[PDB]
Amino acid sequence: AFTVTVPKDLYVVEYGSNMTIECKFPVEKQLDLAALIVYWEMEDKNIIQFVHGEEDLKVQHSSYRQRARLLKDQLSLGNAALQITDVKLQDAGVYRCMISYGGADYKRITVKVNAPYA
Amino acid sequence: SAFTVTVPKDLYVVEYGSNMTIECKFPVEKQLDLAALIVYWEMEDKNIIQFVHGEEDLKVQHSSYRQRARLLKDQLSLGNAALQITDVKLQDAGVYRCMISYGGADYKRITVKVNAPYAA
Ligand SMILES: Cc1c(NC(=O)c2ccc(CNCCO)cn2)cccc1-c1cccc(NC(=O)c2ccc(CNCCCNS(C)(=O)=O)cn2)c1C
């Protein structure tokens, strides 16, 4: 069965940093953009939806409007990498990545945001 | 205008020992395309039913749903992922999640309340 993996299920990040969280999925041979859906959400907020070789942007939640991107390059390696830029305490929580690619799976990732220090 | 899953009810109140059928609707424009369809039902991370590419998996199905859960295949052609659990117990109360991939993808949550058995 098709299986998604996370290198870490817990990220501890510093306030104001950039954060990149990752879900790995098998790509034998080359990538097939037509068969690939990748969705990231937190607490039911639509962060990034990549459906059929393209991101949506319309249904993306306002709080992630110019902050979240999927690293397109990484998709060909079988890596759904979410970058959130300028991490705030509101970004602490449980992230869910959902992948459909000849099979489907999802995984949960917890983010702790430590308070501003640096 | 993205693909959207709907639930006619997001809360089922069921009697102890009854059968329960919970439903997620998804658009089927023309005929059904079994090759492109994934339907997954889970509760509290337990694999209830996984329908991948015109067939159920059954290897990965959780032990506590082994002879109790089935997807009503007939209903799929109408755009209805219908999960039947037979002989509902109090352990079946909780939050159910159906996940559908068919052209696009969506999921919905359903809460099940199981009322207690009578002394009748
Ligand atoms: C729903 C979804 C999306 N979501 C959206 O795009 C979306 C979703 C929601 C919205 C927002 N709309 C508003 C809603 O309120 C807006 N876009 C994206 C991609 C795929 C899916 C989807 C589809 C169908 C089925 C499944 N799941 C499964 O089939 C599944 C999952 C998990 C496990 C368990 N296994 C664990 C590993 C062990 N592995 S082992 C033993 O070695 O076998 C098993 N099977 C998923 C994840």
Residue numbers in the entry:
A (entry chain B): 4 to 121
B (entry chain A): 3 to 122
Paper text:
Therapeutic antibodies directed against either programmed cell death-1 protein (PD-1) or its ligand PD-L1 have demonstrated efficacy in the treatment of various cancers. Herein, we show a group of “nonsymmetric” compounds that bind to PD-L1 and are based on an amide linker attached to a biphenyl structure. A series of nonsymmetric C2 inhibitors were synthesized and evaluated for PD-1/PD-L1 interaction inhibition. These compounds induced PD-L1 dimerization and effectively blocked PD-L1/PD-1 interaction in a homogeneous time-resolved fluorescence (HTRF) assay with most inhibitors exhibiting IC50 values in the single-digit nM range and below. Structural insight into how these inhibitors interact with PD-L1 was gained by using NMR and X-ray cocrystal structure studies.
We managed to cocrystallize PD-L1 with compound 17a and solve the structure at the resolution of 2.5 Å. The asymmetric unit of the PD-L1 costructure with 17a with the P1211 space group contains six chains arranged in three dimers bridged by the inhibitor found at the dimer interface. The 17a electron density was well-defined at the PD-L1 dimer interface with the exception of sulfonamide solubilizer at the R2 position. Moreover, numerous symmetrical hydrogen bonds are also reported, such as between amide carboxylate linkers and A,BMet115, or nonsymmetric with ALys124 or BAsp122. Sulfonamide polar group, although smilingly stabilized by hydrogen interactions with BThr20, is not resolved well in the electron density and is mainly water-exposed outside of the “hydrophobic tunnel” between PD-L1 monomers, likely contributing to the solubility of the 17a. The core is a biphenyl moiety that is located in a hydrophobic pocket composed of the amino acids Tyr56, Met115, and Ala121of PD-L1.22,31 The aryl group is typically a five- or six-membered aromatic ring or fused ring connected to the core group by a linker. Upon addition of compounds 14, 17, and 17a to hPD-L1 (human PD-L1), the proton NMR lines of hPD-L1 broaden, thereby indicating oligomerization of hPD-L1, which we have previously observed with similar compounds. The addition of compounds that displace PD-1 from PD-L1 results in rescue of the PD-1 signal. There is a 100% rescue percentage for 17a, which indicates that 17a was able to completely displace PD-1.The spectra in Figure 2 (purple) and Figure 1 (purple) match those in the broader signals of PD-L1. A total of 83% of dissociation of the PD-1/PD L1 complex was achieved using 2-(ethylamino)ethan-1-ol and N-[3-(ethylamino)propyl]methanesulfonamide (17a) as a solubilizer. The X-ray structure presented helps to explain the enhanced inhibitory activity of these inhibitors.
